[model samples]
Target: ESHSTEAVLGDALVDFSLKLYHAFSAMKKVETNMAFSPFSIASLLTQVLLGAGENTKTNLESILSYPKDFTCVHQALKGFTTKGVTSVSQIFHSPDLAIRDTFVNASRTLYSSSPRVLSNNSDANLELINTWVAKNTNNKISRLLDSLPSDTRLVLLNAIYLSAKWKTTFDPKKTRMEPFHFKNSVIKVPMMNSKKYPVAHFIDQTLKAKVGQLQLSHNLSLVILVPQNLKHRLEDMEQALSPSVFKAIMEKLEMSKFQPTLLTLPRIKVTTSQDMLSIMEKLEFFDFSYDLNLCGLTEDPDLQVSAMQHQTVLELTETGVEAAAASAISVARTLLVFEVQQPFLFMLWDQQHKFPVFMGRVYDP
Candidate 1:
């Protein structure tokens, strides 16, 4: 996407931009390890990362030149995954034990502030948060609040959940059984079968190529870069699919000719979680300058967050199905979650870099 702050931040939702930016960066690294392309994944991650809050601006900016390495990418994935672990312990693993301790300390602080109110309502909130996390992560994140420190109780929780089917359903009968090639072997995978759906057809006046947007939902869409040849490599596609190139293609969309097409995709689901501090460091978003003041939602400033925790889950199915859920929490018991599934390229952009703070692919599986 364009690096200009205004272009990045202009029309996009703040939370969406952050997540999109993070997803995009991580996908760049993941493409090396996984044969799957990054385009769709980038679309999905955006929706989750953007929920971090407007105060995350400075931290998001520090990674402008960050290298798209495997470690960094995996860290980003962990950050997104942890956000979904509000009540699940299986997924959220902290690289920094201290960060986990801080999260516990903060919860203790909140409980101590008002034991009765927190104790009476904590379980319900935890359940709600965990359920939402489970749905978003496609049941990958089952228990986010397990194995809590005995002394810790009455914690506050915040979460987001999103789910949707493909606008144009894939035909199971038409789906041709095939094998998807991995690094070592070919695994059985079902390719989606479809004839057509709502599409935004366009001609890139600059590159003189065809492009299209497949509408996934009311709030989400996928920008498809179709070359004349189907055998094009990911590198060539990435070059042609850059933000500027896509922008030109998008500007020329043939709204009247929008349609779906026959296609097949395999079913896949991935869930992961990690400490945000490690991810931020890997992504180079180390600045502590932004507003660490989450006092608006909590009582103790001493419980200030020196680190963040995040969780993410992704599932993709035939007919280009997709789903995702993400959550983020600071040391002050301030937590938030964002979830989406619609096979679209989503983003969360900051006003400064004019690029997504997070990005990813979300579809049915």
Candidate 2:
């Protein structure tokens, strides 16, 4: 049975949220306008660990901060929710897997996942997978794979789509092109303006930022985090960020009024191709090619994951937002990697004040 929504995550939402931040900021240097679903990525990795040998599992879990042992989570998740979130995750495996019962039963039981034939038919396989993704996401994401690499053995895939309307609509006439501000410069863009205060508003003293929530037709809402000043910078708002602080800020924000809240948003579209393997590499968890174990996969499903890619698209209009993100992983018994290394929990400090200007974690040092 599924746990209560609150307890569903092992009453670890607070813990998990912070751990997720660790996972996210790992990609900070890969600079791009990116969006993510850390839970899905984490779930997929958890599935991977389930199939891994113990030696490899320990290393993987350490990076993931996934408290439990592989034996427990693996066996347990086999019974966890397999329902997709207005979603789909298509997995294709090469014939090289030499399909076995462990891989079959567990992939089916845990992920409700299955493998498909990825012959040298890279062209057709590419189309078939993209077609499924497009159809599932209502075409918002037309292409997930740029081109299928002819050497791939297994591909794990997923998609989440959302489309909804606003609780209140805007007058089309009032929506027009306007100046949108940014840290470095400004640009003219189509923006929807509104004087309607949303469901929640708060001036967070801790964050030194303003938070506002816009309600959609049902239980859906969009929360905006605006860093208090141009000088303060969005990065400043992230200082000392934690799940508790996040909850406290959001909880403290209520139906109280302290400022005139007029919301103006651009009519926009954002599509990002996240370099997942690269991010995972930065986190020191890129063990796909060696010392890896996919023992839970099949009789001996030890294989190297070849590609890790995820793409997302988001569109905002005067009406609402339409968005979706899709996942894909492919593996062969071989491959490559990139590494740029340094020392542990390293920090850059202000000489006089003893204040840290920058910090990087590397306990391995």
Candidate 3:
């Protein structure tokens, strides 16, 4: 009976995996022009979610509505971190309580079972978390685990760090000082110079998008889709960004005509830390709003969630990029942290609701 149940659960998780893969792949393609690779970070996080046992699988399916679309899974995962426990047990605690408890429990589980052994000292935990994050994100998520709560000596940790040099690496000899454009002005920065890098030029009439492509390696290629500058606001960009739009762009691409040219790009790095709830709201995923329907894992009746939290840090390196991400679900008085850092991406989406959350980048300088 146990084997049979696990088999069924595994099948369901597999389906979830497919959706996650699609979402991450699509997002990576979308941001290819930015020279940002999110696949490694996204993939690592997906593995963690899938490995979270049967109860997590069923709860995710019911509350977040699995396999709606790529974006839906992304959003759902964010929502799960924010309100998973509360949503599961709407009896004794309020929404806030649910969120807190969920993370606490997640932290407890992480310290006990994670492959990376945490240090006994409080400061050591920060170092352990940061090191793990740097390793996973290809070194793109730098020093992300520095802010973890000191009281919790051991918690689950996940991290991803990624850094990839351009397939045709920039000529260090010709690398000249150049101005890098920022929000306001341009600052003089080290600009790599390369003329041997591959490029692909194409036009898409269906999505009315222009496409530029570059090969990262033998099997991987960077494809950049630029719509006709349809208002640069986030809403406009999001609206213009859809699966259909990407499909249209892909359909119109011609990879055979790629040419190498002298290219110069700015050196920019972004590091951010956001509360899970706020990030979810930004992505417009609101279902499972503190409901607590998690089943098959626990029978405790008094357990209530207080909070669910997630932290992600990324870093880009000369060789490749790495990233690390973690999610915590606090339940009643327990705290658990789940940390994942690998050579992949972390994505959430729900097809039924048309909500998506994408966070990944390529670190090819």
User: Highest lDDT: which candidate?
Assistant: 2
Residue 33 lDDT, candidate 3, scale 0-100: 18
**Model 2 error, position 219 (Å):** 2.6
Q: Whole-model Cα lDDT per candidate?
A: 0.35, 0.51, 0.34
True-structure Cα RMSD, model 2: 13.8
Q: Write the per-residue lDDT of candidate 2 for residues 4-85, one digit (tens) a residue.
A: 3213333232344345445555565432233444445555667676666677677767755555543455444444332222
- Candidate 1 has a TM-score of 0.47
User: What TM-score against the true fold does each predicted structure earn?
Assistant: 0.47, 0.72, 0.49
Q: In model 2, what is the error at residue 310, expressed in angstroms? A: 0.9
Q: Which candidate has the highest TM-score of all?
A: 2
Candidate 3's C-alpha runs over 4 A off are: 1-142, 148-157, 179-189, 204-210, 225-235, 254-257, 281-289, 296-365
The local distance difference test score of model 3 is: 0.34
* lDDT of candidate 2 at residue 74, scale 0 to 100: 47
